[PDB]
Symmetry: none
Subunit: 68 residues, 6 copies
């Protein structure tokens, strides 16, 4: 009996934002004029901002191997 | 009995923001004029900001190997 | 009995922000003018800021190996 | 008999280039007032800028001369 | 039978380049007043800037002369 | 049988470059007043700047002369 299995395998996760090119992003002119505004509840505002947001809860790897 | 299994394998996680290019990001002009505004609850404001935000709760690797 | 299993394997996590290029980020002009604003609750404000934020709760590695 | 060869080519030629601004008269040229007011500008790439009232500009990459002579006598 | 060869080419020629600004007259040239007012400008890449009232500029990459003569007598 | 060869090429030719600003007259040239007012400027890359009232500029990378003669008498 000769027992010589060879494992050359790859398990790979590539998750999120990878290898992207963002070349000169952004608008020319943004102008906001506000007078006499009432807000009774929460305000979230973005004006001329650039946001790159990456969430990766995933991309996990599990490998199980058994030899008997 | 000859017992010589070979493991040359790879487990890899690449999770989040990897190898990206951000070349000259940002807007030209951003202008905000505010007069007589009332906010009764929480305010989150971004004006002309650049945000790169990466969250990685994931990308974990588990390897189990047993020989018997 | 000859018992000579070979392990040359790799377990790797690359988690968060890796190998990115950020070349000349930022807007041209940002201007904010505020008069008679009332805030009754918490204010978070970003004006012309650059933020790189990386959180990595993940990216852990577990390797279990048994020989019997 | 006998052989006589007389080779007396004469070159009196002119090759001339007159290139650019030559022999002009500019009598009391007046550039007006120049005002450049700039506010709130963004430039992402290379800028070349020239501001002025009166400009005389002469560029001459040309006007090159090439003369080739060959003289061959074989007997 | 004798042989006589007389090889007397004569070159009196001219090769001339006159390139750029030559023999011009500028009589009381006047550049006007120049005002450049700049506020709140952003430049991400190279800036080349030239400001002035009166400019005389001459650039001559050209006007090169090449003369080749070959003379060959073979008997 | 006699052979006579007389090899007397004559070169009196001229090769001439006159390149740039030559023989011009500038009579009372006046550069006007120059004002450059700058505030709140940002530059991320190389800046080349020139400011002045009156400029006379001559650049001559050209006007080179190359003369080749070859003479061969083979009997």
């Amino acid at each position: 009996i000769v027992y010589k299995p060879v494992d050359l395998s790859k398990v790979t996760s590539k998750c999120g934002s990878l290898g992207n090119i963002h070349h000169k992003p952004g608008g020319g002119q943004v102008e906001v004029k506000s007078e006499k505004l009432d807000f009774k509840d929460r305000v979230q505002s973005k004006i001329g901002s650039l946001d790159n947001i990456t969430h990766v809860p995933g991309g996990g790897n599990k490998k199980i191997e058994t030899h008997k």
